[PDB]
Amino acid sequence: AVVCVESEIRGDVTIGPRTVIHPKARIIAEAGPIVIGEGNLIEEQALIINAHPDNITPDAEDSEPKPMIIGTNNVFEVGCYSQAMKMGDNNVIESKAYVGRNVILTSGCIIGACCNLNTFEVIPENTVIYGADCLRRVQTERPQPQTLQLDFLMKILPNYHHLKKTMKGSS
Amino acid sequence: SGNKVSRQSVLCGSQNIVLNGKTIVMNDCIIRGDLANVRVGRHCVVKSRSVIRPPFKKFSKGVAFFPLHIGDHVFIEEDCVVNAAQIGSYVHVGKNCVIGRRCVLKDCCKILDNTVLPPETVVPPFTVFSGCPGLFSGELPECTQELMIDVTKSYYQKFLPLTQV
Amino acid sequence: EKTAVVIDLGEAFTKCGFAGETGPRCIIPSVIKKAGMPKPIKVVQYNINTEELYSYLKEFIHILYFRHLLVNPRDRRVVVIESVLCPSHFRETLTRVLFKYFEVPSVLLAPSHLMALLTLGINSAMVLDCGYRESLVLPIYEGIPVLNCWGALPLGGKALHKELETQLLEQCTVDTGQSLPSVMGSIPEGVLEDIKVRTCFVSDLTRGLKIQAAKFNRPSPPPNVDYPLDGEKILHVLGSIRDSVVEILFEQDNEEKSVATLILDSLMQCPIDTRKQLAENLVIIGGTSMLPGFLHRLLAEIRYLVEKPKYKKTLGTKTFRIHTPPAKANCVAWLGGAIFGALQDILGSRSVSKEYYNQTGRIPDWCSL
Ligand SMILES: Nc1ncnc2c1ncn2[C@@H]1O[C@H](COP(=O)(O)OP(=O)(O)O)[C@@H](O)[C@H]1O
């Protein structure tokens, strides 16, 4: 993976292969061990979080001892954060996506612009939300978890592949 | 030389950038336009918290978004997470803007607050395209826009001197 | 030869386009666009300031021209479609706007029901207009409207919105993320319109009778789908309210005044000869008329009220039949005005010229002199 010197990580994060983190990739995985996936591209200005501390104060039996995870082809773009997103296969997060706490991001997840993810909501597969229309379950089969949106994600991943080699060569 | 830029910026590929004199850049603007070229002009301005990344590879198999472009005496407010926007002369972005991929924002444009332009969303000239999705909100004047952009270049070269060394 | 811009107003949605064009080019609502305006004030309003309506009409018709007409208001005629019984002050304000700021060649404050009749091509029918504000019946015989026979009821789209607001405010089961009622004191109209079209529907006649039995000592159809709402304020609509909303539209409440009863009342005031021809020619126009099952339940309600022992002895066995216009019921009157505007033969003499208004000021209306 492209372990960029500018990619600011924090804590024990046993990453995976092909997890090209771009410059200024501020993250945090200390209170929760976030394992990276295979085939993503952590862009600039991101924010990976782990175990929302006592500022919010979870006064509901804080005995978490649970680590975050990632998946394949789930490249998150700039602006968008990552508040412990239990992703999967090809769950791309576009610009300025306000990542929510308990959103088990399944496949075919196209996190649109300025779409604040729903806390404690099981993000099923094959669903792309609309921008202004929050929670729009539009394109139930067009944004299909496999062969349609994941195929488009692997197609967008090609530019990420060329950029992965280019960033590994430019550094 | 004349571009009295800040010192807490972030970028790579020193020659890939293009920022002529009398410009005013701000801090925390992580513009990683290293691979593809970054084009800008004179008396232009940008603001903090704006990670204006470059468009794309520009040399893919089929089509690919070119290096970059910007205009003279333009202004880009705070949190402008822009990406792939050829700005014309006297353009004017807004706060928390989101420039869509492959957007040739023509001259005398006017972006809005928290406006999320989609990919390949062409914006007309002297027409403030705005809203959440792409929408030609209203029609912006010509004379007042040119005077406001000149005043913007003036204020940018008359305020950047302090608190930036 | 020049065309004719057919402008049609409305409290909910305005319709506009050209002459001869099948269907208007755009249907923009009656809202405005202004800075510092959290809720755009409607252009079509009554019993309010004069100059305020003059400015509202100027800006709305201006943005209407320059955004959906792409033409200067001097090269082509204007046929302003306005329904009958419209307030004279509103018409005078429209005339002031069109002749003092735009300076059009000639306006024509033509009625709505008459051009709705022109769409079908026939010369006589009974027209029920289910507009936004109120319902309106106006019988037309041989191209002439029987103006003394009329009927209005505040049971248009506005009553449906009032019903939906009160009822959904009562059973406000907005889940968390469980009830949470009255979170907001008032809800807007856009969500209410979406609930009307996308979720509400017209029941059946037997289903309506079951709702009547359900009023006091059962709602037989229960289908419902939890309607979403932004900001995770997901509510849950009920399987019975989707029936009750139309039930109040087809309610009588011991006064014998429902939407369908208004046609029978106007048919009662019509002369003896015109009776069977208006029964053989029934036209249903208006925006509220686009509901699923509205025409079927409407005709069933008509025929159910035929054998009522209050209107049977004067009407009896009749052949009721509804016409099918070649356009959508929400935009029939506009198409009639479009066919009329595409008739440049006598419209130059039928409409009110600009010269006559500038040197006279008097506007033709059904009033003495
Ligand atoms: N496609 C549709 N299906 C059902 N109802 C509709 C549809 N379009 C509009 N409406 C209803 O029509 C009404 C608009 O009527 P309108 O023609 O504006 O009345 P007016 O005669 O005052 O202009 C709205 O209140 C809306 O509820």
Side-chain angles (χ1 to χ4, degrees), chain A residues 1 11 16-17 23 25 29 31-33 37 39 46 51 53 58 60 65 67 71 79 84 88 97 100 108 112-113 124 131-132 143 145 158 169, chain B residues 2 13 21 33 36 41 54-55 62 64 67 71 84-85 88 94 100 118-119 124-125 131 133-134 138 141 161, chain C residues 1-368:
Chain C
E1 289 175 350
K2 59 190 178 297
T3 64
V5 170
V6 181
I7 297 171
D8 193 0
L9 294 176
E11 296 185 359
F13 299 97
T14 58
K15 280 80 68 178
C16 186
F18 292 157
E21 183 73 29
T22 298
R25 195 168 296 274
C26 177
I27 174 169
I28 183 165
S30 301
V31 299
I32 53 98
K33 179 66 175 66
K34 182 69 180 294
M37 193 69 71
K39 287 185 178 182
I41 291 172
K42 294 182 182 181
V43 185
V44 180
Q45 286 179 350
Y46 306 113
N47 291 314
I48 207 66
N49 192 6
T50 74
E51 291 184 354
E52 187 176 359
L53 287 180
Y54 185 76
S55 177
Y56 286 170
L57 267 60
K58 276 178 66 178
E59 188 170 0
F60 184 73
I61 296 168
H62 171 78
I63 204 67
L64 192 144
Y65 276 116
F66 291 95
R67 292 294 186 272
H68 302 291
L69 291 176
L70 50 85
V71 69
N72 197 1
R74 294 178 64 87
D75 190 77
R76 55 192 62 186
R77 296 293 180 89
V78 174
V79 178
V80 178
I81 291 177
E82 56 96 28
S83 70
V84 80
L85 297 172
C86 184
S88 294
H89 178 68
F90 191 81
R91 295 177 62 186
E92 287 176 353
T93 306
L94 278 165
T95 310
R96 285 179 183 176
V97 170
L98 295 169
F99 289 117
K100 298 301 179 183
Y101 180 70
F102 295 97
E103 291 183 353
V104 296
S106 294
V107 303
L108 178 59
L109 293 170
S112 173
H113 304 280
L114 183 57
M115 291 179 179
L117 179 63
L118 291 179
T119 59
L120 271 300
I122 58 172
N123 288 320
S124 177
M126 182 70 81
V127 176
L128 168 63
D129 180 69
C130 294
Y132 171 68
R133 185 173 177 85
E134 288 186 350
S135 174
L136 186 54
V137 180
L138 190 65
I140 323 294
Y141 183 69
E142 296 291 327
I144 298 169
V146 193
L147 193 143
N148 59 0
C149 299
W150 64 275
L153 292 175
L155 196 56
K158 186 176 181 179
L160 294 178
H161 286 292
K162 190 174 180 180
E163 175 72 28
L164 275 169
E165 178 181 0
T166 304
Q167 293 302 111
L168 289 179
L169 185 63
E170 289 177 352
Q171 291 86 21
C172 182
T173 61
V174 174
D175 289 330
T176 64
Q178 293 84 15
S179 68
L180 296 175
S182 296
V183 172
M184 297 175 184
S186 296
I187 62 170
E189 294 180 354
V191 179
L192 215 58
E193 287 180 353
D194 290 330
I195 285 168
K196 269 178 62 182
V197 176
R198 298 187 291 171
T199 66
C200 185
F201 67 100
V202 175
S203 298
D204 297 330
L205 188 60
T206 63
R207 292 182 181 178
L209 294 176
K210 290 178 180 181
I211 299 160
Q212 292 178 358
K215 290 177 170 65
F216 295 97
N217 281 319
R218 62 192 185 277
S220 297
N224 53 358
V225 169
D226 47 354
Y227 181 68
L229 198 147
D230 54 354
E232 295 178 356
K233 298 179 289 295
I234 295 170
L235 71 153
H236 189 274
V237 79
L238 302 180
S240 302
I241 193 53
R242 299 177 68 187
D243 306 332
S244 176
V245 168
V246 174
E247 179 63 30
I248 62 98
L249 182 69
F250 290 94
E251 193 175 1
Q252 296 180 358
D253 293 330
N254 72 25
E255 202 174 5
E256 199 186 5
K257 283 185 180 179
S258 71
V259 174
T261 318
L262 199 59
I263 289 176
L264 266 65
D265 285 328
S266 176
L267 191 62
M268 282 295 294
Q269 288 102 26
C270 281
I272 287 94
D273 291 332
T274 315
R275 305 287 175 85
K276 74 180 295 296
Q277 294 193 4
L278 298 185
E280 288 179 353
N281 289 316
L282 188 65
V283 181
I284 306 301
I285 67 167
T288 311
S289 60
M290 285 188 67
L291 289 172
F294 179 76
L295 291 175
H296 186 272
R297 168 67 180 273
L298 177 64
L299 182 60
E301 186 71 29
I302 292 296
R303 293 177 181 175
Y304 182 76
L305 294 181
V306 166
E307 289 86 5
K308 188 174 189 290
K310 291 185 180 180
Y311 292 165
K312 183 179 176 66
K313 295 178 183 179
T314 61
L315 300 180
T317 63
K318 287 185 176 293
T319 63
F320 287 97
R321 55 188 64 189
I322 302 168
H323 287 286
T324 65
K328 298 303 291 181
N330 195 3
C331 198
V332 166
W334 185 84
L335 188 136
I339 297 174
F340 198 80
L343 188 144
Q344 305 176 2
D345 200 3
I346 52 95
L347 194 144
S349 299
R350 183 66 60 87
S351 65
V352 185
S353 70
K354 181 183 181 296
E355 181 180 1
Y356 182 77
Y357 181 70
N358 288 119
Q359 75 184 2
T360 303
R362 189 182 71 186
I363 298 169
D365 190 2
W366 46 278
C367 288
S368 65

